[PDB]
């Protein structure tokens, strides 16, 4: 059908449709007289799997015997969403697995829809890992992904009442084909113990042993015929665990509960004993693993020549003290040797500066649990600080700032303190949040080794957040410049010299217009939800959460519907206003948000005075494959955190590269984007970040905005008085109170200048040639938030090797 | 090789070495270079698989299409051991793959040794539901077998310091390559709630759910192409179970937990919660799929037509107030059909008389977790116990005696009473049993309805405990009769003509000769034990008992010793005395039974004087697999249990198969034994059942035996005294103590008899043609003893179906 599907050969579709009927019979053991649409998703998936398999096994001997330097990604979260059309995109076969379904009766993307999304990660930073993975075997480098197989990945997200209820995502229930389960290397990771002092050094002994198996998944560049391994690690009892009878089995179960259940906090710290025993299971586990396959090829001097840790947050922070303990307790190398491999070896990416997302570990867990660490922790702390003390003679209360150990109530370690120290790099991810970084939080550390701080901006992978969920644009755009732009996304900009062209212009808002018209249709099977598709798309897809300010957007959205109400016969523009995204089960402020938005929705949505000129739709269960359908979809992209307060943002890019335009503050990687296409082609309202902090040394008082401000008053007075709960009439009390009072960032100081943005956007709408010549400028200069850049940038920088575009042999 | 084991042909052979490379590469994903044994045995298990499925595929169309009457045979044990043999053996395979593995560099039968046993039984009930499987599908009946897929089967025994010591039985850690979970078909099974009475009748309302999975296994007949399902059920909490939010999702464990071990006693009740959980859990899953199958073909009285549930002991006896609840709660049959459409479907097969055996449930356990099967079991009493009366007027301790509910202190349901009232028939498992079942505990029953009670002397499969096990016995038989034997087992009395032929008695002789050489290599390897192939190899293997009498074998092993000690110069005929089995966990006199096995073997195997004239070797974790190594390779078996104690015995059968000869009582199938093969060919001694209720007439004073017999008491002395125990002198006084005032199982009063008839085992010994000759005589007369014979005559006697020896086309 579309020329960047692949091709079609005769040979490869015969062979297709034989492979296929192969699975459904001896695989799946079924005739095709009972076989269901399910059955009909695992005979193509294994069919596809199989084409991965020898690539794999050549990869994999390939990186044996060139003994490349080996990058390992650690991480808590995968968030990996399906595979199945992935992996044909990435081995060029999607077409011809079209005509084969084709050929067999079947309707390919509807097996497509079957597939559970793998959501192992709660938002941002667990995608940013899936798209980093897929850019790394794009590039080439011998890069391997590990984290934690847990059975129930994030919540399903189903709304009752206008509430969010969560139920578990028992996302394997039906088998995963993508994964090996590898039960030949499982290794042991001990807790608890203690430590005991010899004439040869400390032994931590008495511990109990949990298992860790890995399951590999593997992960295939972009038509190059490289495939790289994710391994995530389960935990297992020992069978002589606990080992009346009966209750003994059924308390394997305790150690199993490791690996059980994704922590759905984004960006908050819960100090809890199972989380901590995650961290150190991963950390563990992984390290082992590492050291068996530098071994295999006495001399840690070359270690960091052939190994790099990449931290993924301080998540993963206890390989640095694990690393010690191994080099010093077990291989026998002096501290200071230990410490040098540490260092040049491990690397560390934060991910945010909100003080309630860092992780400060009480010491009393870390004693009870992981004895010798907290040893190690300390050791590290006081030859760290007596560098300090040299560098800055007499500066005490620096002493206490940079101190890896909190004093308090509860004595507390700051694991982000650790990885300073233990890091020969250390990285934001938007150039405004790494000079944050340098100017507030780790300005000491950056005083004392400046050479650490470097800046790497986040990025999208073009495979999945454009040929694949966009195969119109990607066509359109590749009939003009024709394919190496998938993998080299800086050639969009060639783009710009079609801005005036009659037919390149009519395409885009065609391909546009495809999308939202199958987006609408979507809605009305899956939801029973009627929206009109000539209306501008105004979306806000992302984690609920205060900084993320979907208050702000439900403010707008009441002032529009107030100003119909009171000049009805006034032409407007139309908008389906989208708001979806999950709320932490514990996060009391971020599930009454979700109540707002559907209860505005059970007003306006009713009116019959607004018609279809303002509908407002809670898009439940957002997850990664929704995002794929609804990106695009959209017109406008909301993205209108408070100043910084995102440390970059991804969602941003994704609808950039889709042909959204922009709404958004001066915060994370909006300041880029808006950078590389023009000020003039994206719309900033609000507060910069100098304007926060000078409002923060007055004193934010929102009461004078409401006192000002008529329209902001009466959607107050709205709330507080039942308008939009009339049952239950005192139902948002807490939301107003906390606007009134409470607000940690700062929803009304940047409430005129949205409104008034947003009219701007309307304003442009009604012009569709304009606004799609301005979409032609966002697309065409949206190519530096390619995660291949990115991982180029931390390959050349940070890891020190070079990444390649030559293809392995098929 | 051997001429049963098939063709190898030259096409057959390289399809066989094509599919396994294909395998190992696809399935496995691993090349040649880093594969282990374990890989090898994955690719030559899922080769052989694949020639399973399109058999079963079609044998279960067939089923459908001719719609015959369907066998349910419903079991909380199935001890199948491994399957890769079975198959081969069943599909005629076993000579091709052994040609193919040769040419690949593979040793087939060290492949073999990596499969786990599934060991999801105890012992003989387990074993004889997995014979049946194997039976019925060589029969040609459609039959399936329903149980529980346990996550730890029967616990794997390891002995420290002479003691047992249990680990998990972790089978299903590398995967099982032969089931297939079928999640389509998962089912709902309710637990706890409460009885509300509407107008409309009764409705179980406000229960817990818990969901059933099942796995299906395939049983291939004997190369008839008939292959049938073993379905078992997985529990699986539903996704809004529980649904702070971590804890909840921890907690479906306690719904997982159903499913998750086998509990491990032989011959004993423990009526605690979650067994009873596991018994509703495999019945109310069952029978939701034997209703669906039948309404897929409004009139159950064609139910009865169309299935058979035979009960396998009382454990799914919950199937009988099930059925009526379905039918009179949600078919809305009156009570009166849907009673007789019950007793004409289900069928009770009792494998016990052991007071302790038997499963009585207190009330108040019935009560709370399964309210309306409580009440249902009433009604059925209430109704029973009026025909009681009315046949035998004024009888009331009748109507005591023979009432489902028992008073006492704690009121408990009899559930071998249920199973009698809802069953059309009722069996024994070998001639002896059902006679004292007639007579002793169901007297007043069989009174009531003698038509019911039936006999159905239990076997074993020739095709496991023959052809896979020794195939040099089955060679060399079929070298003279041909092959047909293996599924008419009757065709062994054909041997009898060969009884004085030099030429088959010198072959015999040979085959137990290479049998016992092979299995004292194995000792060598995986033991480090080293004993005579010259001598009389004496074995008991089966669960540790006190009705088995393992202790009575330790009586006459010391007595040997201290017969050599006494006499050092004499000549005995050498002895290698093996016991062997595993004691249930909490079984304190069973595991002291152990302790004295292994500390006479410390005694007797380091005595100089003894030299290689006597070795005592316990058998470290007997299970299906060890059988198949130790009954062919056993010259003397040992089947030694009180005269009316053991319903049957099925390890009898494989030994006198197997060409050992037999010293035994006259209890369960023994006596059918002898009376098949002649009281001359068996080695029968002690009291019959009607001695020992005259014993128990008088009163059994063990003092009387201690007194008379001075080499009893001279053993007696030597246990008491710390002979066996020297650091430990007391070690042995709880069973001095139990031999002397509380025994229960009569050992002395056997002992001189057992004595005196092993001294004339020995005498038989020292000619060994002589021995060969009445060995030739078992084994001719040993057809009676096949499972094919036993379901022949439950298909025409209980589930009114023909079995048939036609083959289905391949
Ligand atoms: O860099 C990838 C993305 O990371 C997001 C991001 N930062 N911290 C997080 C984060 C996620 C989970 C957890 C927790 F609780 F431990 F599970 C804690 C912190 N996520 C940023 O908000 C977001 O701005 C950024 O684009
Ligand atoms: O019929 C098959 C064999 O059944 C054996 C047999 N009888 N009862 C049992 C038996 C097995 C397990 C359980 C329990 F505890 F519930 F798990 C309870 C009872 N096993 C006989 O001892 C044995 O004599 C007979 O050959
Ligand atoms: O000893 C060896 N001989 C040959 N190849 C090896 C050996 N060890 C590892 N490899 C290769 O690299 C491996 C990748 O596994 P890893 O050690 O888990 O990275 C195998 O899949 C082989 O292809
Ligand atoms: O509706 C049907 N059409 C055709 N075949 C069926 C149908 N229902 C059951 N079968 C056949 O019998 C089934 C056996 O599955 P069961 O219902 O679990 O016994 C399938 O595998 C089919 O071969
Ligand atoms: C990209 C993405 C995110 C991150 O969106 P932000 O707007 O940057 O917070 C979260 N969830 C899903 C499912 C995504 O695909
Ligand atoms: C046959 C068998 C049994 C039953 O043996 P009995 O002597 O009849 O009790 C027990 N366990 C295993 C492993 C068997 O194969």
Redesign the interface.
């Given at each position: 059908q579309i020329s960047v599907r692949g091709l079609a050969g005769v040979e490869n579709v015969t062979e297709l449709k034989k492979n296929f009927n192969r699975h459904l019979?001896?695989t799946l053991?079924?005739?095709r007289n009972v076989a269901?649409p399910?059955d009909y998703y695992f005979a193509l998936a294994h069919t596809v799997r199989?084409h991965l398999?020898?690539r794999?096994?050549r990869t994999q001997?390939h990186y044996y015997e060139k003994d490349p330097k080996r990058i390992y990604y650690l991480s808590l979260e995968f968030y990996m969403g399906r595979t199945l059309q992935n992996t044909m995109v990435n081995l060029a076969l999607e077409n011809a697995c079209d005509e084969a379904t084709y050929q067999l009766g079947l309707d390919m993307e509807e097996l497509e829809e079957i597939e559970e999304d793998a959501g192992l990660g709660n938002g941002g930073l667990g995608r940013l890992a899936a798209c980093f993975l897929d850019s790394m075997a794009t590039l080439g480098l011998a890069a391997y992904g590990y984290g934690i197989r847990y059975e129930?990945g994030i919540?399903?997200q189903k709304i009752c009442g206008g509430w969010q209820?969560?139920?578990?995502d028992?996302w394997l229930?039906?088998?995963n084909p993508w994964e090996?389960?590898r039960?030949?290397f499982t290794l042991p990771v001990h807790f608890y113990g203690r430590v005991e002092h010899t004439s040869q050094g400390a032994k931590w002994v008495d511990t109990q042993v949990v298992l860790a198996m890995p399951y590999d998944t593997p992960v295939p560049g972009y038509r190059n015929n490289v495939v790289n391994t994710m391994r995530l690690w389960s935990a297992?009892?020992p069978?002589?665990?606990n080992?009346?009878?009966?209750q003994a089995?059924?308390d394997?179960?305790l150690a199993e509960?490791i690996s059980?259940?994704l922590?759905?906090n984004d960006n908050f710290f819960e100090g809890?004993e199972?989380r901590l025993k995650q961290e150190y299971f991963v950390v563990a586990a992984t390290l082992q693993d590492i050291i068996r396959r530098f071994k295999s090829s006495t001399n840690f001097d070359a270690f960091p020549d052939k190994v790099a840790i990449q931290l993924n947050d301080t998540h993963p922070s206890l390989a640095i003290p694990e690393l010690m303990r191994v080099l010093v307790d077990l291989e026998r190398l002096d501290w200071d040797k230990a410490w040098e491999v540490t260092v040049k070896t491990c690397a560390y990416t934060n991910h945010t500066v909100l003080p309630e997302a860092l992780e400060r570990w009480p010491v009393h867990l870390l004693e009870t649990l992981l004895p010798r660490h907290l040893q190690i922790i300390y050791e590290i702390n006081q030859r760290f600080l007596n560098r300090v003390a040299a560098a800055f003679p007499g500066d005490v209360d620096r002493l206490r700032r940079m101190s890896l150990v909190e004093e308090g109530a509860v004595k507390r370690i700051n694991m982000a303190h650790l990885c300073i120290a233990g890091s020969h790099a250390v990285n934001g991810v938007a150039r405004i949040h790494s000079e944050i970084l340098k100017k507030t939080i780790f300005k000491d550390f950056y005083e004392l080794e400046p050479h650490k701080f470097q800046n790497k901006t986040n990025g999208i992978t073009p495979r999945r957040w454009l040929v694949l969920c966009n195969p119109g644009l990607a066509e359109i755009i590749a009939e003009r410049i024709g394919e190496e732009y998938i993998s080299d996304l800086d050639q969009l900009r060639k783009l710009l010299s079609y801005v005036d062209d009659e037919a390149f212009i009519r395409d885009v808002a065609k391909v546009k217009q495809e999308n939202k018209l199958k987006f609408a249709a979507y809605l009305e099977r899956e939801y029973k939800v009627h929206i009109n598709p000539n209306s501008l798309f105004d979306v806000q897809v992302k984690r609920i959460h205060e900084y993320k300010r979907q208050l702000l957007n439900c403010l707008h959205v009441i002032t529009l519907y107030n100003r119909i109400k009171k000049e009805p016969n006034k032409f407007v523009v139309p908008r389906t206003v989208m708001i979806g995204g999950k709320a932490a089960?514990?996060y009391h402020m971020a599930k009454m948000i979700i109540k707002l938005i559907t209860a505005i929705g059970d007003v306006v949505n009713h009116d019959p005075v607004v018609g279809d000129r303002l509908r407002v739709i809670f898009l439940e269960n957002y997850r990664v494959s929704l995002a794929e359908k609804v990106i695009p979809a959209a017109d406008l992209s909301e993205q209108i955190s408070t100043a910084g307060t995102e440390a970059s943002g991804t969602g941003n890019m994704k609808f950039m590269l889709n042909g959204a335009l922009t709404i958004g503050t001066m915060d994370g990687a909006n300041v880029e984007m808006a950078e590389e296409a023009g000020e003039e082609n994206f719309f900033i309202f609000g507060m910069r970040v100098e304007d926060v902090d000078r409002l923060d040394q007055r004193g934010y008082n929102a009461q004078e905005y409401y006192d000002r401000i008529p329209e902001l008053r009466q959607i107050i007075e709205q709330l507080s008085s039942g308008f939009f709960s009339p049952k239950q009439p005192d139902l948002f009390k807490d939301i107003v109170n906390m606007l009134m009072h409470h607000d940690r960032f700062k929803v009304f100081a940047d409430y005129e200048e949205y409104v008034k943005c947003q009219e701007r956007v309307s304003a442009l709408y009604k012009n569709p040639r304009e606004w799609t010549r301005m979409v032609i400028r966002n697309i065409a200069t949206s190519g530096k938030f390619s995660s291949d850049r990115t991982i180029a940038q931390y390959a050349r920088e940070i890891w020190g090797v070079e990444p390649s575009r030559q293809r392995l042999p098929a």
């Open positions: 019979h001896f053991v079924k005739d269901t399910r199989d398999v020898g794999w096994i001997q129930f919540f399903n209820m969560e139920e578990a028992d229930r039906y088998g090996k389960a039960p030949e297992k009892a069978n002589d665990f080992l009346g009878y009966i089995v059924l394997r179960n509960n059980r259940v922590y759905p809890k199972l089960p514990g």
